[PDB]
Amino acid sequence: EVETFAFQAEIAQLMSLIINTFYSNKEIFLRELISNSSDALDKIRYESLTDPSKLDSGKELHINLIPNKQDRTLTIVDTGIGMTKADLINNLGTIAKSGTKAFMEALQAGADISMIGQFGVGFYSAYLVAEKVTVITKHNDDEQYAWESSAGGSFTVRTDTGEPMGRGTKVILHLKEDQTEYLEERRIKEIVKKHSQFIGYPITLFVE
Ligand SMILES: Cc1cn(-c2ccc(C(N)=O)cc2)c2c1C(=O)CC(C)(C)C2
Numbered sequence: 001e002v003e004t005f006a007f008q009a010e011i012a013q014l015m016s017l018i019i020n021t022f023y024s025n026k027e028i029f030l031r032e033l034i035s036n037s038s039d040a041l042d043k044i045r046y047e048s049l050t051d052p053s054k055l056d057s058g059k060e061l062h063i064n065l066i067p068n069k070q071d072r073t074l075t076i077v078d079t080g081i082g083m084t085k086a087d088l089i090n091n092l093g094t095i096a097k098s099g100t101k102a103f104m105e106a107l108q109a110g111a112d113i114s115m116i117g118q119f120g121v122g123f124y125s126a127y128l129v130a131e132k133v134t135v136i137t138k139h140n141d142d143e144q145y146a147w148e149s150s151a152g153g154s155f156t157v158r159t160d161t162g163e164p165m166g167r168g169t170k171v172i173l174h175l176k177e178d179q180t181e182y183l184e185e186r187r188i189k190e191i192v193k194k195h196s197q198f199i200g201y202p203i204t205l206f207v208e
Pocket residue numbers: 036037040078080081082083087088089092093095096120121123135147169
């Protein structure tokens with residue numbers, strides 16, 4: 001069973017702004033997704049200090065960057081806290097609504113798209129380079145889910161029947177035809193070094 005949901009008006013507005021605004025500094029999407037992964041890793045690591053059994057789903061705390069030229073996808077994998085069904089459908093959307101309002105107000109005042117992470121809606125920068133985003137996630141307190149959206153005001157959520165993850169999140173970016181530079185090893189290495197050199201978890205860039 002695939003469930004279809006409407007994005008709240010503010011989020012659909014944010015997605016349309018990211019997709020339609022002329023902005024050449026698209027590379028910032030990677031630091032934003034790595035930041036989401038780092039925050040998720042900090043959360044599971046902190047929770048594990050009071051409850052060590054929270055790491056029974058996997059002790060390794062890392063980030064993997066996987067390019068796939070055949071599928072035209074860039075995948076950001078983390079072994080962070082993951083997201084529950086409630087996080088995917090309601091909780092993150094609630095914080096995203098207030099974050100969007102503040103971001104769009106800041107943009108009107110003269111701020112640029114690269115400041116998106118300060119408003120906690122950095123995940124949506126994925127739409128600067130991706131025509132579709134698939135999010136596979138597994139939280140300790142819930143099942144493995146697949147969230148997906150090609151924007152257009154809707155997203156889907158289904159129980160994932162793919163390879164079991166243990167715990168964490170996979171953000172699969174189905175890249176736009178003209179954004180294939182983000183599949184090149186030297187381009188990804190350059191972006192990681194420039195914006196994510198001090199992330200407190202190992203970042204492994206997979207090769208093809
Ligand atoms: C806000 C927000 C933040 N994140 C997000 C993305 C990734 C991670 C992680 N753990 O790697 C954490 C949070 C999402 C949002 C959304 O509205 C849409 C979403 C629920 C599909 C994703």
